[PDB]
Structures are given as structure tokens and as C-alpha cells.
Amino acid sequence: GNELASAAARGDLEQLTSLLQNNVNVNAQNGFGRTALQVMKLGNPEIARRLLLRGANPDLKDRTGFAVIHDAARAGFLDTLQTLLEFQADVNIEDNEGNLPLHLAAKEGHLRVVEFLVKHTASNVGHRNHKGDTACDLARLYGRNEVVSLMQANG
């Protein structure tokens, strides 16, 4: 419901955890059509882990076409992105413009996140989004040269 989502949003682990003991529905949307896992405080991997551990489905995308792994990848919160995968989140889930978390991490210059995706995930690199671009292309199109290099020094 709504209090679970807000607790996830303000990152109140304490409060979130009570709510999760009442056999509530972790996947229910709040008044904004979003779920607790989706609006959660990205810098807190534990918020994610507990929700996942209670059934939260990682691959649900909102009205705007995003999944948590997209926003985490876009913010460069690798640990959270990693605990997400740890619970079977799909690395190649695309947003509504055909993006992968990788695209967004690349587009944002998060080198240690690109590093990880490229070398330790099934992240389909060559994937081209709806504009025909690639993660590496976007890095190029955005100046994330440092990222471009590493990326191509690998793929």
C-alpha cells in the first residue's frame, strides 16, 4: 500500500520493516501508481533486499516505463543494482525507449557501474535503443569519454 511505499521512499528501514511483518502486499501501487521497490531510497541496498526478500518483483515498470534497476543504474548505486541482480532482476530489461540499465549508467558517466555491467553481467552490450544508439554510443554522444574508452577497451 501507501505507507510501505513512503517508508521505502524516505528510507525508514525501521518503519518499512514493521509494515512488512503484517503480511501486506509488497507489490501494491500507491496513489501515484508506483510500488515501494520502485520509489525506494536507492542509496540503501538493505531497503531493497528486504522488499525483494518478501516478494517484491524487480521487473515491474511504471506508467513512465522504468524499473528500479533503471533508476539505480542511472544514479550509480551499484550495491543496490547488485543486490537487485542478486534477487534475479533482469539485467536487460529495457525502459520504454529501449534502454538498458547499462545505457543509463553509460549516459551518466558512472564508470564503476559500466565496469560491472560489461564484465560481470549478461548485459546485452550491442543492444540498440529505439533511436538506434548503444550504451557506448550514448557515452560518446554525452562526452563520457572516460567511460567510452573503458567500455571499448572491453566492448
Binding site: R10, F32, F77
Partner: protein, 293 residues
């Protein structure tokens, strides 16, 4: 706006209205933070403070300091005469100092990171003071930390309550960073913020708060237990709680609590944690301290 910004979650509500998490639909739906207030129309028109506060935010934004949270926009929605829904849009960082500190592996935060964050913190703080702005509520949950490791000063107006186990009492965490002049209801000037920097500084090492008081008289004591009773010359004149109100306090070596801090770190730390506000270091001075080399 209000068709460009799409709310996804309410974070809370406090002194600045309600705080939400929303998507910026004109920048790829990236997360952005919003503050919403219901402004009351007077027979004098728009309330002074409302105007003044938005004025100052908009104005400091001009300078675009890297260590202060960006203010992207200001949207207005006039209901009737008596009401106007005012909305401030800011950059959003899904992590604050607290969520970071109590997440680091066991060894603790790298001493070099503590320095870097601490430098940025005083950087943005110096910027505010130099433009005659006092934060007055510097608490770690108002200190944003990007995954990049960048510090951005916020001010959500949201209180957090902490409940003491055995005592069955509670406090608003900000109390733990409140400077003595403030606790003694004496002066409320700019040095006020330096005392908090000092508390936050110490917390980076401890990854646990330094002075966890249960009241303001309790807090005062927790402080004097560590820094020691100030001398007659350093206690505020004409104040409700006299120097005599607190029995003899030695002055334990700060490192006894801010474990693993270094010699120069200790020096800076105590210059912030200096009782007499007039002898407390300044953000600008601290910034020039040999700790930062």
C-alpha cells in the same frame, strides 16, 4: 509545471510543506524532489517570508555552487484568493550522510574520504555564510551524498524522532547537533552551524553520533562531559542556566570518543567544537586548516 513533474511518492512533511519524490518528465523522468506549500493570501497580499525565502533560494541558485542542492524550478497554482499552491523543484540525491555512513564495511570510512567530504561540506557551508545565510539545522540527513562521493547541502525541514531504549523518552535527532548558544537560548548567529559541522565531522569517524542528549539540559551536560566546563569568561552572560548549574567537568581527550582520528583532525574538530561562539573557528578558516593540507 504540474504536468512536467510527476509525483511517485510522498517522503514526508515538516517545516517546508510536504516533500515528494517525482519524475522530471522533460529530462528522461529522472528523479527530482519537490516541496509543496499552501500559501495563505493576506489583505497585504503574498506573505513576506514566502516571498523572501523563495527569493533567496532563487538567488543563491544563480551562483550554482556544487556543494548546495540545485533548485530547478518554481511552479504556482492559484486555487482561490486565499490559497496558492506553491511548489519548489530541486535536484534529488537518493542518499544522505546517514544512509552512507551506516552502510560502509567494518573498517570504517577511508580517512581520505572523510577529508574529502568534510572539505566539500565546509565549501558549501562557507558559500551560504558568505551570502549571509545561516542553515541552523545541519543534521546528517540534510547532507546529501551522490554515488560519486559528492556532498550537497539540503534543508528538507523534516524531523526524525529517536526513542531511548531504557529511558522511555524520545528526542528529535537535530537536538544532537544543536550548538550550546542555541541550547542556552542565547545567541543564534552563524557560528551556530560550525558547531554542527564539528558534530558531523566527529560522526564520520564514529559512524555513531557523538552527543546523544535526551533534553536540552541533558545535551548540554553530555557536551561539557567531553569538552569540559567552560571558564567564567566563556559562559554566556544573563542566561537561564548559569555556569554554576553544571558541576565540575574535567575535559576528556576527544580521541577517546572520536576513535582513530588524527592529530590535525583532532585540532580542527575541537576548533569547531569550541563552546564560546566568538572563539569558534569559521567555515573559511577551517577550510584553510592544515588538515586539508
Amino acid at each position: 509545471a504540474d504536468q512536467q513533474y510527476e509525483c511517485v511518492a510522498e517522503i514526508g512533511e515538516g517545516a517546508y510543506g510536504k516533500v515528494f519524490k517525482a519524475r522530471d518528465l522533460k529530462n528522461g523522468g529522472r528523479f527530482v524532489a519537490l516541496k509543496r506549500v499552501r500559501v495563505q493570501t493576506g489583505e497585504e497580499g503574498m506573505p513576506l517570508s514566502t516571498i523572501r525565502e523563495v527569493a533567496v533560494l532563487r538567488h543563491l541558485e544563480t551562483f550554482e555552487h556544487p556543494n548546495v542542492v540545485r533548485l530547478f524550478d518554481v511552479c504556482t497554482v492559484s486555487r482561490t484568493d486565499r490559497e496558492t499552491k506553491l511548489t519548489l523543484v530541486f535536484e534529488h540525491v537518493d542518499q544522505d550522510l546517514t544512509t552512507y555512513l551506516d552502510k560502509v564495511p567494518e573498517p570504517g570510512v577511508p580517512t581520505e574520504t572523510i577529508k574529502d567530504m568534510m572539505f566539500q561540506l565546509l565549501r558549501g557551508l562557507d558559500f551560504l555564510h558568505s551570502h549571509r545565510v545561516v542553515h541552523r539545522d545541519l543534521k546528517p540527513q540534510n547532507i546529501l551524498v551522490t554515488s560519486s562521493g559528492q556532498i550537497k547541502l539540503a534543508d528538507f525541514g523534516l524531523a526524525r524522532i529517536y526513542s531511548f531504549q531504557m529511558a522511555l523518552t524520545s528526542v528529535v535527532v537535530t537536538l544532537w547537533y544543536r550548538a550550546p548558544e542555541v541550547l542556552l537560548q542565547s545567541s543564534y548567529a552563524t557560528p551556530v552551524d560550525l558547531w554542527s559541522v564539528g558534530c558531523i565531522f566527529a560522526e564520520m569517524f564514529r559512524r555513531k553520533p557523538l552527543f546523544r542528549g535526551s533534553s536540552d539540559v541533558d545535551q548540554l551536560g553530555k557536551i561539557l562531559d567531553v569538552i569540559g566546563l567552560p571558564g567564567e569568561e566563556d559562559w554566556p552572560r544573563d542566561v537561564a542556566l548559569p555556569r554554576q548549574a553544571f558541576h565540575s567537568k574535567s575535559a576528556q581527550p576527544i580521541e577517546k570518543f572520536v576513535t582513530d582520528i588524527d592529530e590535525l583532525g583532532k585540532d580542527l574538530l575541537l576548533k569547531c567544537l569550541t563552546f564560546n561562539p566568538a572563539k569558534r573557528i569559521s567555515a573559511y578558516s577551517a577550510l584553510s586548516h592544515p588538515y586539508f593540507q
